[PDB]
């Protein structure tokens, strides 16, 4: 189990390496055997979509004391948590764990 947390897989999802092909600018009229180091500058754009279906294990604890949950505090503040600032920068205030429910040993 990777010590930073997560899932340990012998065959994780593969890398997706993307490269935009070189297109040489204008090679000489006379032959030359070198690597043709003069390429025209360019880049790319698009979209990338990652649909990754999870499987859940619902909880059925017979606990009577109300569970402890994760909530966002109701109190007036300059910015909503997990919402963009006046300039447009998306700010995440705190790390969110995944251990909130309680299950007896």
């Amino acid at each position: 189990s990777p010590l930073m947390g997560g899932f340990g897989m012998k065959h994780p999802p593969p890398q997706i390496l993307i490269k935009n092909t070189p297109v040489p600018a204008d090679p000489p009229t006379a032959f030359n055997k070198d690597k043709l180091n003069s390429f025209i500058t360019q880049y790319s754009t698009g979209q990338v979509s990652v649909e990754i279906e999870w499987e859940l294990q619902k909880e059925n604890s017979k606990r009577w004391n109300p569970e402890i949950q994760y909530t966002s505090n109701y109190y007036k503040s300059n910015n909503v948590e997990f919402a963009v600032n006046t300039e447009g920068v998306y700010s995440e205030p705190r790390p969110i764990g995944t251990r909130y429910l309680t299950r007896n040993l």
């Binding site: 606990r63 009577w64 004391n65 109300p66 569970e67 949950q69």
Partner: protein, 105 residues
């Protein structure tokens, strides 16, 4: 049926099928004999008087009536948490009132 045979088992679970929440409940009841099996009438004239606003005239029937129109009769506070936290409304759909296991003393 018969003295030595329980006439019904104690159901108290609270199933959560999904879009249906069957909330059984069971408590032990003790019922005395009210009013010595009579129908004495009640008025503020008998209860020592009252203001003009509080005058009333009614009968004190000797019957006891089972009342369960309070939400905490059925919903354990954990169920009430699971029903307010993530739900946009609810309404009763059916009822089932088993009165079993009488013993007169």
């Amino acid at each position: 049926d018969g003295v030595g045979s329980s006439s019904g088992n104690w159901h108290c679970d609270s199933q959560w099928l999904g879009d249906r929440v069957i909330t059984t409940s069971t408590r032990t009841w003790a019922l005395p004999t009210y009013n010595n099996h009579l129908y004495k009438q009640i008025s503020n004239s008998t209860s020592g008087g009252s203001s003009n606003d509080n005058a009333y005239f009614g009968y004190s029937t000797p019957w006891g009536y089972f009342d369960f129109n309070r939400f905490h009769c059925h919903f354990s506070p954990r169920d009430w948490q699971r029903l307010i936290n993530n739900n946009w409304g609810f309404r009763p759909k059916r009822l089932n009132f088993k009165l079993f296991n009488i013993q007169v003393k």
